[PDB]
Amino acid sequence: KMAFTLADRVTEEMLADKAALVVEVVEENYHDAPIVGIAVVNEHGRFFLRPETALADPQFVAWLGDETKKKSMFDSKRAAVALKWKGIELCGVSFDLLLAAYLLDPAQGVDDVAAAAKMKQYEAVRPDEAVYGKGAKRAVPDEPVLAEHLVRKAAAIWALERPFLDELRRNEQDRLLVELEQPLSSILAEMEFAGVKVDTKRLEQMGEELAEQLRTVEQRIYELAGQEFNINSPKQLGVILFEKLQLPVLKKSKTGYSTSADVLEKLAPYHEIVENILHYRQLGKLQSTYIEGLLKVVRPDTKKVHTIFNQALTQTGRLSSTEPNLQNIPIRLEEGRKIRQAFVPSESDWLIFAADYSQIELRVLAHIAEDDNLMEAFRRDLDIHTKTAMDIFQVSEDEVTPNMRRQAKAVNFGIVYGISDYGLAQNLNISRKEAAEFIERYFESFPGVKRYMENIVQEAKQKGYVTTLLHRRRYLPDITSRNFNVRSFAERMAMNTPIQGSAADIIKKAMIDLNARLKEERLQARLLLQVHDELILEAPKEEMERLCRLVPEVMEQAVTLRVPLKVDYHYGSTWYDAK
DNA sequence: GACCTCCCT
DNA sequence: AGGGAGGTC
Numbered sequence A: 001k002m003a004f005t006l007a008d009r010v011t012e013e014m015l016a017d018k019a020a021l022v023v024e025v026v027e028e029n030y031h032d033a034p035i036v037g038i039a040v041v042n043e044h045g046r047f048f049l050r051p052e053t054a055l056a057d058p059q060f061v062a063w064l065g066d067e068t069k070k071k072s073m074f075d076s077k078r079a080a081v082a083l084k085w086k087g088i089e090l091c092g093v094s095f096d097l098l099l100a101a102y103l104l105d106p107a108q109g110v111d112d113v114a115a116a117a118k119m120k121q122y123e124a125v126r127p128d129e130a131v132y133g134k135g136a137k138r139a140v141p142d143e144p145v146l147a148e149h150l151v152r153k154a155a156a157i158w159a160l161e162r163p164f165l166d167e168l169r170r171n172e173q174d175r176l177l178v179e180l181e182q183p184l185s186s187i188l189a190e191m192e193f194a195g196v197k198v199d200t201k202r203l204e205q206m207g208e209e210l211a212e213q214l215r216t217v218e219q220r221i222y223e224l225a226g227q228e229f230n231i232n233s234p235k236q237l238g239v240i241l242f243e244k245l246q247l248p249v250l251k252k253s254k255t256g257y258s259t260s261a262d263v264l265e266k267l268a269p270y271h272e273i274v275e276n277i278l279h280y281r282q283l284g285k286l287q288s289t290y291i292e293g294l295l296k297v298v299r300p301d302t303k304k305v306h307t308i309f310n311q312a313l314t315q316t317g318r319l320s321s322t323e324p325n326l327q328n329i330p331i332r333l334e335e336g337r338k339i340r341q342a343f344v345p346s347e348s349d350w351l352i353f354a355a356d357y358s359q360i361e362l363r364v365l366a367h368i369a370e371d372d373n374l375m376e377a378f379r380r381d382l383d384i385h386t387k388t389a390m391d392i393f394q395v396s397e398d399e400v401t402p403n404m405r406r407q408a409k410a411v412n413f414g415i416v417y418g419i420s421d422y423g424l425a426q427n428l429n430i431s432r433k434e435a436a437e438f439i440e441r442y443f444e445s446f447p448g449v450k451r452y453m454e455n456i457v458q459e460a461k462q463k464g465y466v467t468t469l470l471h472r473r474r475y476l477p478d479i480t481s482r483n484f485n486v487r488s489f490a491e492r493m494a495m496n497t498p499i500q501g502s503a504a505d506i507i508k509k510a511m512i513d514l515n516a517r518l519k520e521e522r523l524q525a526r527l528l529l530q531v532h533d534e535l536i537l538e539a540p541k542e543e544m545e546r547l548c549r550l551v552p553e554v555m556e557q558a559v560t561l562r563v564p565l566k567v568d569y570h571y572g573s574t575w576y577d578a579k
Numbered sequence B: 001g002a003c004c005t006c007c008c009t
Numbered sequence C: 001a002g003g004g005a006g007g008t009c
């Protein structure tokens, strides 16, 4: 039962210039959420402070905001954002244990202090789920249980900083933490806090239209089936399709019949019900996920959505986005793409600006494999899919048909994602031997990429892990498995991770550089979103001409590869128009 | 509460 | 390759 002072007021010894700090936000979504307690551990002892007290105290608030007072935390973004909503600035965070753990091994799934501490045989702190409970039983406990927990977390952070930093340094990941991921965390905090404005009237009118179209298609489905049923029930739908209407059963699921879109597409020539079910699903997905889903998370006071970017989740170093997810808003089909009309600038006479890398993953691959043919292709800024068709089919530019380009494109994705005989076959709807011939001809045209693929697999086996341009790592223990499927998946991860991961490194660095350029130029332009290889901003209309030159340049110069990077850009009144 | 089709890069 | 988010048990 760890010693600490349950403090009634803030004292000078709580404001040392080095400390572990816990600002606890228990709600999963930390936007405008309560801070339930504070703990500080420093050279003078261990302290718990009630937030009503600490956050009203001018000395404490100035300490929080002083860059020269260094704090070590876990998930400093959560605290920073929660504090921003209360008008308080958090500065001087020099060590974030969540990001440190994530870099050391993303596969551990570290999401609390206890899981991080377990990596170094430190168990004198409880998992958050043990203290707060799970699901419906989730609750803040009484003060003495709460206080002890926060203090134990702080004490763990204080104890673990040094060994985590030592291991990062041995991995050559110390600059990755200190110069990339930690400064990025501040930039993401500002993006989440600013949020993105939504035209909720426009979404509601879309929702009304969709509701009418759904009622129509739905009636049509019941007419064509000859009865009413729950179209979203796999049991009822599978009975209608595969028993009542006798459609061929092309694929089963562990429980019943598959009605995935790929199966339905193949069944459409047999019965008119099938196109209507597909249409119903496109509409229903829009309605349910995007319209209703966005509307439920829009803040009614500002009409903004404030995503949370999970910076310590993906196995490759990408971000993810949640509540809402703003990295999967429809774009591919026009009907869906119109959802983007509802994402608007947050001030009048401002516009949305979007800049995206062109083929970043293939250009990274060109660089890392040093394939002469691929590098020349990007040096000429060729259409990479047409060029790959020309090579694999041994034809001139004029003889590449649309279908040939389409298939070369699939091969390029396949090569990036780890090249499987069977996997390319499923994808192109072709045979296994056929897919192998495409891959062999690819590797004959790009022998540098073949060498890379062989070499990276051997390197993952030898070292136990693969690395990215900026020294992110991924351990791949399944690469020595004697099970074919398990081993092959590890091999694909070995081939793909340095590509997807290095692309993630580059865009993160560009975000950092951009943020610094925007400040130097004193532009009001603000970063709103990152969607893997693109950045989305809003700015005054009067800044567009300048952003057209600045943004692509910063993004293109973020790193120097053996091939150029290229960035395209667009702007307009809504996110839809920025493209 | 847990398990298990479709949107994005 | 990497993610986030209703029916049935």
Ligand SMILES: OC[C@H]1O[C@@](CO)(O[C@H]2O[C@H](CO)[C@@H](O)[C@H](O)[C@H]2O)[C@@H](O)[C@@H]1O
Pocket (backbone or CB within 6 Å): A028, A029, A030, A075, A078, A110, A111, A112, A308, A310, A311, A312, A313, A322
């Ligand atoms: O604060 C984001 C940060 O917290 C973790 C838990 O350590 O994830 C929590 O917050 C996410 C966003 O609200 C939730 O989606 C997630 O379920 C919740 O545990 C980290 O994974 C994340 O980096």
